Amino acid sequence: SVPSQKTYQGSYGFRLGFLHSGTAKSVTCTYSPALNKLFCQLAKTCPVQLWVDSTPPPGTRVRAMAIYKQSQHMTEVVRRCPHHERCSDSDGLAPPQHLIRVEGNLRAEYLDDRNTFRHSVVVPCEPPEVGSDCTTIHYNYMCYSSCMGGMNRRPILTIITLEDSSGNLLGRDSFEVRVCACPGRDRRTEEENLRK
Ligand SMILES: O=C(O)c1cc(OCCc2ccccc2)c(-n2cccc2)c(I)c1O
Ligand SMILES: [Zn+2]
Prior knowledge:
Layout: E1 15-17, E2 29-32, E3 37-40, E4 46-51, E5 61-68, E6 100-102, E7 109-112, E8 119-124, E9 135-141, E10 156-163, E11 169-179, H1 183-195
Parallel strand pairs: 3-11
Antiparallel strand pairs: 1-4, 2-3, 4-9, 5-8, 5-10, 6-9, 7-8, 10-11
Subcellular location: Cytoplasm; Nucleus; Nucleus, PML body; Endoplasmic reticulum
Organism: Homo sapiens (Human)
């Protein structure tokens, strides 16, 4: 009733990577390695790199799912709040209840799990473009961490899993997410809190 968050590189050496976007007041998405935490604005592009040591088979896929970070909330499905699920901002593919969307990939599939009711979005693995060493997925987070009746200030993790064509686990990585109005300031504040 709780998805695993154990980091697992697996046979292909799977792991995530993030850009170095800085902490200026204008930044829309920024990743803190010290906190393993992504800070982003509502519905803005979040580039997440996928890295492997060797090529996985055709039909391998990459799934993203959010869970609450605190154990006392982990069994609760992470979903959009009562306002955002009704705001008719559909892209034509993501269900309006889903917090995490994939941007710009018509092969993305959205799952409402028939047993756990959890939401996820999954895309086929594609090899890097010529001249690149990794592949990037562009995610969007569709509610603020503060949204009342939804995340309600509770921290979340995103779990990224590499899966075979039948959904079996090949690799796993994860990161905390805060969706907020000023990611650069919040990253600076939280890194300062950690240093102190
Ligand atoms: O270097 C590589 O060949 C490489 C390959 C990758 O999967 C391609 C799977 C595949 C294989 C054959 C036909 C169609 C599709 C990925 N990849 C993409 C998302 C997660 C992993 C990465 I990153 C790589 O670097
Ligand atoms: Zn919301």
